[PDB]
Structures are given as C-alpha cells and as structure tokens.
C-alpha cells in the first residue's frame, strides 16, 4: 500500500475581476517531498510559484494574480504533486478547483439566484440559468439522480435524462458548502 495526497486550502476561488491577487494554501500531505506544479486552464492568470518543492507534510502559499463584466468567467486552478511480471506504478494527484472570476458590477451572490433555475425536457433535462453567475450544482435529481454539472451564467446546460417530473437541486455556495434544496415540477 502507498498513499498520496494534495490539499488546497479552498475548494473554489472567487476572484474579484481586476483584483491584484488572492492567496491560496497548498499542503503536501504525503510523507515524501513532491514538486508542486500549478497551472490555470480555460473552461492571463499567473500562479507564483508555478513549480516548487514542497517537503513531506509541509504547507505553502500560492499567489494567483490576473473578461466580460456582465457575468462571471470560469477557469480551473490545477495543483499537482509530482515525485521529483513485476508491476511498479507511481501516481501524481492533480487537484483542480474552480477559479471564478467575478465582476464587482454584479449584484448579489449565486445563493440569491439558485432558486431561479428554470427547467424543461427536450431530446435531455435542460436547465436555464438567467443569473450572471455560474450555478455550480452539487446535487441533482429528476423523477427521483443525475450526475450534476455547473450551469454557465445567462445560459443553459443539457443533462442526459436518466414519467415523474420533479427536479430537485442544491448549488454549492461560495464557501464550498451545499446550499438549500430547491424543488420544482417540470
């Protein structure tokens, strides 16, 4: 048996548009040193340092430093812990969280608008998000379970249907917790 682990201090980052930067902690929970390799992916941003040695059990800080202004944009911050017939396999965890670029022009927060998802079925269960925020669904059931996905702002997302017509969902709030359960008849 061999254990691997990479912990990021937060499960998502809310990045205020044009902000100088934010700091996020990373921890090597493994008992061997690793190289921590950090990269930002599309769904312009600098991660310092992008590669550094993090010894066994050690934690360090990353700096993330910087788009439409009418809605959020989504990026992914990936943090990877790299080792610097017989079968030998080595693993490397690549821990990715949502980097949510949020204009100050935006009124409210996702939880204020989680209830406003409207739904229809064609083809596929379709959600409609009229809010300027990513609606990061963490729980979704239709007719009593659907692998959830975020609904992009001012946009739609089509889930595969898995004749009952209830849809229940929870978004993940800005703090990484599951929000209230909302339910509508479709």
């Amino acid at each position: 048996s061999k254990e691997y682990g990479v912990t990021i201090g937060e499960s998502r980052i809310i990045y205020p548009l044009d902000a100088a930067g934010v700091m996020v902690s990373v921890k090597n929970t493994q008992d061997a040193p690793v190289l921590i390799q950090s990269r930002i992916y599309d769904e312009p941003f600098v991660v310092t340092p992008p590669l550094f040695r993090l010894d066994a059990k050690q934690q360090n800080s990353l700096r993330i430093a910087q788009f439409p202004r009418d809605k959020e944009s989504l990026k992914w911050l990936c943090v990877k812990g790299i080792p610097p017939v017989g079968v030998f396999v080595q693993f490397a965890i690549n821990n990715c969280i949502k980097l949510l670029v949020r204009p100050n022009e935006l009124k409210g927060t996702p939880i204020q608008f989680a209830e406003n998802l409207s739904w229809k079925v064609d083809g596929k269960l379709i959600a409609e998000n009229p809010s300027p925020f990513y609606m990061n669904i963490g729980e979704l059931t239709f007719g009593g379970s659907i692998p959830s996905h975020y609904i992009p702002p001012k946009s739609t997302w089509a889930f595969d249907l898995p004749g009952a017509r209830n849809v229940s969902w929870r978004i993940i709030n800005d703090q990484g917790g599951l929000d209230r359960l909302y339910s509508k008849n479709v």
């Binding site: 937060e10 998502r12 079968v87 030998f88 396999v89 490397a92 965890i93 690549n94 821990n95 963490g138």
Partner: protein
C-alpha cells in the same frame, strides 16, 4: 471555508505470472472529493484512450494495457475517455486496475507506469 483535500491509496494486487486477462493488477481508493466519474481522469505518457499502458524496463519496450473500473460497472476517464457517468460514492471510491493484455504479445521482468490522477472538483 471547505478545503479541497484529494487523497489516493494504491494497493498492490496478486503477483503476475506469464498474461491472464481481467487480472487485478491493483486497487485504487480515491478520497476527499466533494463529484462524478467524468470528473476524474487518469492519464499517462502513452496517452492511449481508455487504457493505462505498462512498459518493460529492459529496453525491449514490451507493453500491456489495463483498464480502470469501479462499481453496476462504471469508469473514470482514462486518457480523456470512459471505457464502461455516475455520482461517485460519498467519502471515497474504489477503482480497480485490471489487465487487458498485450497487443504486441511479454518477457518476464519489471513493468512500469507513471499515472496522473486529475480530479476536477464540483
């Protein structure tokens, strides 16, 4: 503020003798995620869609492939593609690395792979 802790435990399977197919090479337990099966991607250098490739260390470049599966049979992406989408179990999920075979047909000796496990939280 909830942290994103991702953990992985790898447990070796039975010794392999010259190969049988569907052999359990080893078991993986992925934990800490908040998360569906298509949110997990196991990648390696060979980059063979759906399979991890193990290569000999004798310079002869013998290779066999493996699939990664869990339970109804499910699968994370392997090199960007699913083999066999669901919500992962709470807390942790077991994945099993199972031999397929060798397309090239194997010397006894040591075989290796370096595998990246990408978890896209949420």
């Amino acid at each position: 503020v909830e942290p994103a802790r991702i953990t992985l435990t790898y447990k070796e399977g039975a010794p392999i003798t010259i190969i049988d197919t569907e052999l359990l090479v080893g078991t993986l337990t992925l934990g800490g995620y908040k998360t569906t099966s298509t949110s997990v991607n196991f990648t390696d250098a060979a980059g063979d869609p759906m399979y991890l490739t193990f290569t000999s260390q004798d310079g002869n470049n013998h290779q066999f492939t493996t699939k990664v599966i869990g339970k109804f049979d499910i699968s994370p992406k392997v090199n960007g593609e699913n083999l066999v989408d669901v919500v992962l179990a709470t807390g942790s999920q077991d994945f099993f690395v199972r031999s397929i075979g060798s397309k090239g047909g194997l010397a006894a000796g040591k075989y290796t792979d370096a595998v990246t496990v990408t978890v896209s939280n949420q």
